[PDB]
Amino acid sequence: PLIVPYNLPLPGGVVPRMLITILGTVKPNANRIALDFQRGNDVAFHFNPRFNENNRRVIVCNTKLDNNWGREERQSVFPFESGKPFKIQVLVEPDHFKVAVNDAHLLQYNHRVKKLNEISKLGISGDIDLTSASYTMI
Ligand SMILES: OC[C@H]1O[C@@H](O[C@H]2[C@H](O)[C@@H](O)[C@H](O)O[C@@H]2CO)[C@H](O)[C@@H](O)[C@H]1O
Ligand SMILES: [Cl-]
Numbered sequence: 451p452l453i454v455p456y457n458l459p460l461p462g463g464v465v466p467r468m469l470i471t472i473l474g475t476v477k478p479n480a481n482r483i484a485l486d487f488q489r490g491n492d493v494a495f496h497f498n499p500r501f502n503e504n505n506r507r508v509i510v511c512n513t514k515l516d517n518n519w520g521r522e523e524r525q526s527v528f529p530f531e532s533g534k535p536f537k538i539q540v541l542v543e544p545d546h547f548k549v550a551v552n553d554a555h556l557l558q559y560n561h562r563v564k565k566l567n568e569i570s571k572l573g574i575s576g577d578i579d580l581t582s583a584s585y586t587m588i
Contacts, residue, residue: 455575458583460487463567464542472538472574473582480532480577485540487547488571491517494563495547497540499530499576513562525557535581541588542566 458470464487472485480501487495493514500508507528513520529551530536541548546558563569574583 452580452583454578454580455573456580456583458572458574458585460570460572460585463489463565463569465566466542466544467587468542468585469588470540470542470572470585471582472540472580473535474574474578474580475535476530476532477577477579478533480530483530483576483578484573485538486573486575487540487569488573489563489565489568492563494561494569495540495559497538497547497549497559499528501530501532501577509557511557511559515563520562523557523559527556529554529556 476483482501483499485497486493496512496514498510498512500510509525509528511523511525537552539550541550546560548558549556572583574580
């Protein structure tokens with residue numbers, strides 16, 4: 451019921467205790483999913499499940515500054531499956547984003563962009579049917 455790519459504004463940026471929840475279903479024969487927490491043109495946190503990178507499934511995380519991608523942090527634990535519904539929860543903590551998928555902790559990503567209050571948009575894209583994109587304070 452939501453258009454993809456989807457832009458979710460994050461008013462006044464992010465802050466510790468902010469929980470962002472994305473519900474969707476992976477399409478059959480999916481290639482990629484991307485969450486992009488943006489600070490203007492910069493990407494503070496790119497969370498990028500890849501379903502077929504040299505016949506491997508991997509999650510690539512990174513930051514884009516001044517149009518340049520930085521050093522990739524790769525996670526081989528891969529909780530997504532083509533055709534299946536998922537929940538991604540991103541909890542903002544003082545020193546990292548903490549990601550859980552389907553209620554199971556997946557990874558953390560240390561804050562490289564430090565102006566948390568300027569990370570004011572989340573872009574959601576890729577091979578999914580998007581059901582819900584929302585946030586709350588815990
Ligand atoms: O780093 C995130 C970024 O990756 C780009 O692709 C990389 C690829 O991961 C790497 O193996 C290769 O050496 O360089 C490519 C270009 O930097 C994606 O194009 C981009 O969308 C992000 O996902
Ligand atoms: Cl910064």
